[PDB]
Structure formats: structure tokens, C-alpha cells
Design a protein around this ligand. Structure first.
Ligand SMILES: CSC[C@H]1O[C@@H](n2cnc3c(N)ncnc32)[C@H](O)[C@@H]1O
Ligand SMILES: CSC[C@H]1O[C@@H](n2cnc3c(N)ncnc32)[C@H](O)[C@@H]1O
Lengths: 342, 336
């Protein structure tokens, strides 16, 4: 479950130099020789540890160890000293495999990143989604929904951007929030004296988790679903969006803070187009819609998202901004959408 | 080269192995198995195309799979595994021409979106890399330590005091500064004289070419109306300035994490010499370290109270885009 690696990039001899080290440790060897692809040598230890040593023909040498800790540290050290005599080196941090505390959460653009996580605070499946809250030293508690990092206690920048980056005056305004169960936006918007904020969150268990564990993002705003100038509704935002349109209710601001794949109990792109149509129908002619776009590098996904903006019952314009959100480890795009003036 | 991984965590070993060895055999891969008394199994599969697979089975329901490969296999495994009762991280590219893996100060493995080696040379002092990131722009990496990216204006804003300082008519010393970031931004602010003391000319000359979003045109001339660059070790320069009794409004220590010499006593020395050339009512700014390295940061705070004179300090945590970790920036000044 501890997997160590060692890479050598150079310009049979290497095998003969390295083999020695493994015999010296009492490990048993078996070599597979390839016609013009070099060698694979496997090394098994009594204690149930093993090493793989791949030697490609063009001077690429890769070594793996799997697992007492110091033994292997020292063995990799022996491999470096020996390779110095025999003559680029890469010795990445070992990867824990099957740890009780899971540190690896790839970015939306498919990059491998290890987080500074020391404690599983919350891990529960809800009717809709897996919900984890993992503690980071630097990032505080982090909310992770269906394996996608949503927000850490450090990510005020996300909230700032989806709120229009300080350009908007929320004083006495009517606001709708879709999703947003971390309480981030609701917490910050309520300090600003809106007339009324409505947040529609389908998953009570996300709120439960966040109220207890992300208080540095939501403060106390999530303790009562109903407050001075705000209400939290536990339902699917789709039907709520329809009700509001049907009664012809409109808002100054609509803020879509759903997960990347919204939750449905009723293709993914049609769904996004649907929410936009509904949000527009309840958005004041002179109002604004804000939402999270995607990471900067998912250009095809950003491009398909903007096709949906062109597919709505009404013409709209939009602006984009790139924002650095601390726990994301990839820059993120946020959208501002508005109705085209008649 | 391409090294894929598949991890199964569970709540019988021989049954799993037996269930699995079909897929590999179905590919023409030869097999050897290593059996342990109460340690589980190791299966190794070889393909004449040069790829291989490791199938490690622990007796307590840990099934680990490796593959390389200069996919469908991995898919085909996950399918069978569901029947027999999961972590499938992005494969790591090993020994690639373009190196994407640049670990954090606290020792975490992060992968960058690097798609070009722009510049890679050894100077007499350090190895200097400039690598292109799709989202960060060009990133300057000195001895495998990520120093600054074209996106990292926040670092530069922070190390200049976060907009609290007024630089007009002021006298400024910079230590290091080879990427030209602070230099380009301070010169904008009508200072009296900025002096930057960078030891490695080669860092200036790579940045001049490849990091213009951070440095602009400021590294095109080493003297300007309100600045000058000296290409030497800041040490002899700091001593010389003390001897002449030269004193500065601000001293900005923009050094590499491990300053260059021809540990803690050295950092102390730099603090000492900067303090000697610091005006009584001045300020010294510097980068500290990542928030996680608390021993390092504490060991550094210890040195602040080991200088010729008494000093006070404050610190702030900053988000620098390409760093992939939060960073602490120090502000130090002489006790009243
Ligand atoms: C953490 S902010 C993301 C929130 O959006 C919520 N969400 C996802 N889909 C829907 C939906 N259709 N209606 C309301 N909330 C949703 C998720 O449950 C999550 O708490
Ligand atoms: C990238 S900005 C960091 C800079 O600090 C510079 N540096 C490191 N040590 C010293 C030193 N002793 N004197 C002057 N500059 C230095 C490095 O050459 C680099 O350009």
C-alpha cells in the first residue's frame, strides 16, 4: 500500500549493476527478457514487499517498490548511489494506495493532485450523491460531492466571483440561489442586507454536513432555514423554477450554484440549457445571472456550454472571468449572463 | 512510460486471481505467479509489444493493479470485479520528454498542465527551467522549485506589501528578482531608485525572452531613469552598502528558497545584513514558505529574534495561482 518510484533517463550493464542490491537484501529475482524491449526484473521479499525494475532499450530505467519504510527509502538510496557510479532522475513522493484517508482528487482537467488531507470528517451517501468533507491543513474542511471538489473553507474567492466580483449592489434586492448547500453565498449575501434571498437546495444532507463542519464558509446562516431576509427550500430547483415562472415571480439576481452535473430524478447539455431557460424566465430584464463555468483547460466543455446560451427562448449576452480558487488547483471560469436589451 | 493504476479496496484472494487471469491470457500475456504464505499473491503478465502488468493481491481485500506500456484492460477488470463481491488515478507519465510533475514544498505530488519545454539550461549557480502551462503561462522553475508563473501577479503584489505601501520617491533594494516581476511593477510607481541584486544573469536572460507577461520590457535595459540591476551575489553587495552607511526605505528579499552561496545561519546572515541597510522606519518584505511547513516557518520565526537588533513582524497567507499551495509572506521592521 506504499508505492515508491524512481525514474532514470539516460543518453544489460544497468541490470548487472542493480541486481546486486536486491540479492544483498535477500529478495528473489526473476527476469523476463524482451527481443528489443529490454528487461523486467521482479523482486519479492519474505515480508510481502516487492520491487519492479523495468529497463527499456533507449536508456529509460524505472523502478517501483510496494509495501520497513526506511528499508525501502534506503534501497532507493542504494539505487541512486549505484546509478551515479554506472553513469536525469525523478523520485516523486510515494503514492499511498488504499489508505484509510484518501488524499488524491484529480482536477476536472484530469491531472493527478495530492491534497494535504489528514482526517475524514464526513463521508455519507445521500439519496442523490456521495458526500465527503475532508480536512486539509491549509484549505480547512473541503466539501467533495461525487468525487468533485466543490468548496473548502478557504475558497471565499469562488463566492466572490459567482457574486459578481464586488460590482453588484445587493442592498434591498431580490435574489435566487440554485443549489449552494455549502452556505457560502447565502452567508455572504445575508450580511449585505438584501430584501430577500431564496436558496433552493435538493440535498438536506449537504446542509447538515456543512452546518456542522464548514462554519468558516457558512457561519451560522444554515442553522435556520428561515431568517430575517432569506429562506432555504429543500426541493429540486427545477419544479421551484417552474412554480416561480408560472406565478410570474422575478428576481434581480439568479445565481446558479449547482454541482457540475446537476441532480435529476426526471443529455447533460440539454439539462444545462433547461436550467438556463427556467432561470431566464424568472430573471428581471435588467437583472443578472451568475454561475460557475468550468476549469480553464476544458475548452470543448466551455464551448459546448456556450452553445446552450445561444439556444434559449430569449437572446442573451455574457462575459467570462478566470478566477483562482484556492483548493481547486486549476483556474476556473465564471459566467455573467444577461438578457439582450429589446 | 505510461504507468496506469487500479485500486480495489474490499472487506478471498485465490478466487479474485482466478477470476482475473482470464482477461490477461485473453490478450496473449504470459504469466508468472509468486505465492506467499499469508501475504497474498503477485501475478506478472507480459506482452511481446513491451508492456506488462502487476497484479498484487493482499489477503485482507486490497487488490492493486499496475500497467505500462510505451485501458480496455482496466475497464475489463472493473467489470469483472463488480461480479466478484475503487480508485483509478490518472496514469503517471514516466520519463516523458516534457516533465509535468513538480512536487509542492510540503512534499505532495502535483501534476501541471505543461505542454512544452521552453528553456532548460544549467547556469553556474542553478538549473533554470521555463515550462509552458496552458493555464498559468510560462513557469520559471529553479532547481526543481516552482518560482513564478506568468499568472502569478498575486505573489508580486504580496511581496510589495499588498497595496498598503506608497512607493513614490522611495529608495528600494531588491534581493534576487531575476524574473523581473517586482522590478516591472515597482518602476511603474514613480520610485526614486530601485536597486536589484541578482546573482545569475542567465535567469534575467531567460525571463527577458520567455516571461514578458511578468517582466514586460523592464529587463531589456539594466539601467533606467529610476532603477539599476547589479549582476552579483547580494551578500558582498549588502556588506558594501553597510560600510558606506547606505540605508533604504524598503528591502525586498525575493531570493530562491535556498539562497545561493559560493542553512539557518545563512538566512540569519541575510536578515542581519538587510537590517543594517534598512532605515529605522522602513520595512523588509520577503516570501516565507508554504503554510504547511510549520517547523520551517517556526524555525524561520526563531531567526527573526536572533538578529543584531530587535525586530517585529507580521505575516499573511496568499493564494499564488501556479504554486498549488498557500504561501506565507512576511513583513519585518525594527522594534521602535
Ligand atoms: C455544494 S453547492 C452544490 C449543491 O447543488 C445541489 N444540487 C444539485 N442539483 C440540484 C437540483 N436540481 N436542485 C437543487 N439543488 C441541487 C447539490 O445537492 C449541492 O449541495
Ligand atoms: C527567480 S527570482 C529568484 C532569484 O534569486 C536569485 N538569487 C539566489 N541567491 C542569490 C544571491 N545570493 N544573491 C543574489 N541573487 C540570488 C536567483 O538567482 C533567482 O533569480
Amino acid at each position: 500500500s506504499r508505492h515508491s518510484t524512481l525514474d532514470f533517463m539516460l543518453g544489460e550493464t544497468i541490470l548487472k549493476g542493480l541486481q546486486s542490491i536486491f540479492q544483498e537484501q535477500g529478495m528473489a529475482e526473476s527476469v523476463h527478457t524482451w527481443q528489443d524491449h529490454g528487461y523486467l526484473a521482479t523482486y519479492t521479499n519474505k515480508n510481502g514487499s516487492f520491487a519492479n525494475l523495468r529497463i527499456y532499450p533507449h536508456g529509460l530505467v524505472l523502478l517501483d517498490l510496494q509495501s520497513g519504510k526506511e528499508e525501502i527509502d534506503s534501497i532507493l538510496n542504494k539505487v541512486e548511489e549505484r546509478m551515479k557510479e554506472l553513469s536525469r532522475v525523478k523520485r516523486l513522493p510515494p503514492i499511498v494506495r488504499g489508505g484509510a484517508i484518501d488524499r488524491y482528487w484529480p482536477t476536472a482537467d484530469g491531472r493527478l493532485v495530492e491534497y494535504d488531507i489528514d482526517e475524514v470528517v464526513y463521508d455519507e451517501d445521500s439519496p442523490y450523491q456521495n458526500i465527503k468533507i475532508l480536512h486539509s491543513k491549509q484549505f480547512g474542511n473541503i466539501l467533495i460531492l461525487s468525487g468533485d471538489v466543490n468548496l473548502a473553507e478557504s475558497d471565499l474567492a469562488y463566492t466572490r466571483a459567482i457574486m459578481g466580483s464586488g460590482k453588484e449592489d445587493y442592498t434591498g434586492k431580490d435574489v435566487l440561489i440554485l443549489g449552494g448547500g455549502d452556505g457560502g453565498i447565502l452567508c455572504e449575501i445575508v450580511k449585505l442586507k438584501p430584501k430577500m434571498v431564496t436558496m433552493v437546495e435538493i440535498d438536506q444532507m449537504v446542509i447538515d454536513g456543512c452546518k456542522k463542519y464548514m462554519r468558516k464558509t457558512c457561519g451560522d446562516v444554515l442553522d435556520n432555514l428561515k431568517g430575517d431576509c432569506y429562506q432555504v427550500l429543500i426541493e429540486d430547483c427545477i419544479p421551484v423554477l417552474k412554480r416561480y415562472a408560472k406565478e410570474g415571480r422575478e428576481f434581480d439576481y439568479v445565481i446558479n450554484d449547482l454541482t457540475a452535473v446537476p441532480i435529476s430524478t426526471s443529455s447533460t447539455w440539454e439539462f444545462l440549457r433547461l436550467i438556463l431557460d427556467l432561470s431566464m424566465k424568472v430573471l428581471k430584464q435588467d437583472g443578472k445571472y451568475f454561475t460557475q463555468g468550468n476549469c480553464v483547460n476544458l475548452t470543448e466543455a466551455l464551448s459546448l456550454y456556450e452553445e446552450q446560451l445561444g439556444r434559449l427562448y430569449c437572446p442573451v449576452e455574457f462575459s467570462k472571468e478566470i478566477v483562482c480558487v484556492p483548493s481547486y488547483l486549476e483556474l476556473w471560469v465564471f459566467y455573467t449572463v444577461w438578457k439582450k436589451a429589446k
